Each structure stands twice: as structure tokens, then as C-alpha cells.
């Protein structure tokens, strides 16, 4: 449950940080 | 995993940039 | 901006895809 | 996806297409 | 309640669609 | 305190999921 | 998009209304 | 609410109107 | 780790609440 | 601190308005 | 709206600045 | 910052300028 809310902020960061380069999300 | 790595300990922007394509 | 949408896009994908995970590109 | 879902709002269905 | 239900155990999109009007 | 941050992601999901149908939020 | 605003609208309502809860419709 | 607060930015006050 | 996700929602609130007045964030 | 104050106990909009400039 | 960007701006600043903290003004 | 980063998208670099 903590991990799920965390995952949400992970992809948000990955979005800013990866940018044009893009990314894949896997748990 | 991203979750395994970054939801237990706080990851830096640099450590996150690794999971980028 | 279109960048703003991308932010909302991944959140959605995040809730929709789940354990399956997903991919984002521009 | 940007093309698809950032001009017209995509349904939960259309997004689900983008899952891995 | 939504909170009671979905902040203890992770709710699916389907279980959330119930609290819609 | 966990419940409060969680509630925040709840309404966000409810927003995507409910859509035109709309929703009510109560804790 | 206007859909993007709705997302920001509910977050706000979420912080403003609190225990009182709130309603969102389009 | 969309009409109100998505064309011009609504104050904490105007939003509070929308609470249940 | 909880504190980090929390900080994220803090600045978001501070943003809505502070508005034109603005703010400084420090942990 | 903001964190110290508001990540342990839930802060009201009023208590947050203090950290504004 | 431009207000929407501000919301995304601070989140970014939040991830970029970190412990250093940051300042936001309009 | 609004002027800078809300008309054209700012890099992680340009934002870092705004840290305290
Ligand atoms: Cl969170
Ligand atoms: Cl937006
Ligand atoms: Zn947005
Ligand atoms: Zn969160």
C-alpha cells in the first residue's frame, strides 16, 4: 500500500528525469 | 526493481535516470 | 504545453496498467 | 500516445492499449 | 469507507469505479 | 498521516475512473 | 484540455474541504 | 466548477463552495 | 522515505495555499 | 520544520499558510 | 491557465532541489 | 520561472537554477 503510492511518485519522477528519452515501468 | 530500490530508500535523480530508455 | 499532459498521461497509465507496468515515449 | 491522448481525452480503454 | 477500504489494501480500478456517481 | 496522502491519490484515481460520471468524496 | 484542470481541481478540493469531503462533476 | 475555476483561477474561497 | 513522498504533497499544498504570495521550501 | 511539523501530524490549510512568503 | 504549470513547476523543483529546498514565486 | 519554464519546457538544468 505504501509501495503503491510510492510507485505513483516514481513514475512522475521518471517522467521528468527521463524526458524525451522515455521509460518503461515495471514493479 | 525500481520499486525495490526506490521505495525503501530515497533515490537521487541520478539513480532514477538509469531506468530511462 | 503538451509536457503537462505527459505528466497526467503517465499517472493514468500508472493506475490503469498496474502490475503489468507500461511504457511512455514522446 | 501524446498524439492520441493529448488532443482528445482518452478513455480508460484507449489507455489500456499502452500497458506493458 | 473509501479510505477504510482503499488505504489499507490496494483497490483495483474496478473496486474504485463503485464510489462513482 | 498515511491516510491523508493516500486520500489524495484516491481522489485522483476516482477522477480518472469516474470521469463524466463524477463522484463524491467522504473520509 | 480542460480534463487536466479537473485533475488539479479535485486535488485542491481535496485540501480545502478535508474531512467534510466534496463532490466533483463535469 | 469547471466553468468557474478552469477559465479563471479560483480562490481557496471560491473552491470552498464546492465542499460537501 | 515516507517523509519524501509527504514533502511532495507539502509543496503542492503550499502552492495552492500560498499562491501569489509564494513560498520557500526547506526540509 | 515543515516536514517535522506536517509529516508527523496532518496540518490544516491554516497551519500551512504560515510557511508562505 | 499558467496556474497549472506552476503546480507542475514546483513538483519538479521539489525533485531537482531536494534537501537544498527551493523557492517559488509568481 | 513562470516566464522561463511555462512557455518553453525547462531542462533539469534550467530548473536547478531555481533551487535554494
Ligand atoms: Cl504519496
Ligand atoms: Cl496540467
Ligand atoms: Zn497538470
Ligand atoms: Zn503522494
UniProtKB/Swiss-Prot annotation, chains A, F, I:
Changing residue 9 to D: In HPRI; Providence. Changing residue 23 to S: In HPRI; Los-Angeles. It comes from the Eukaryota. This is Insulin B chain. The gene is INS. The chain holds residues 26 to 52 of 110 of the full protein.
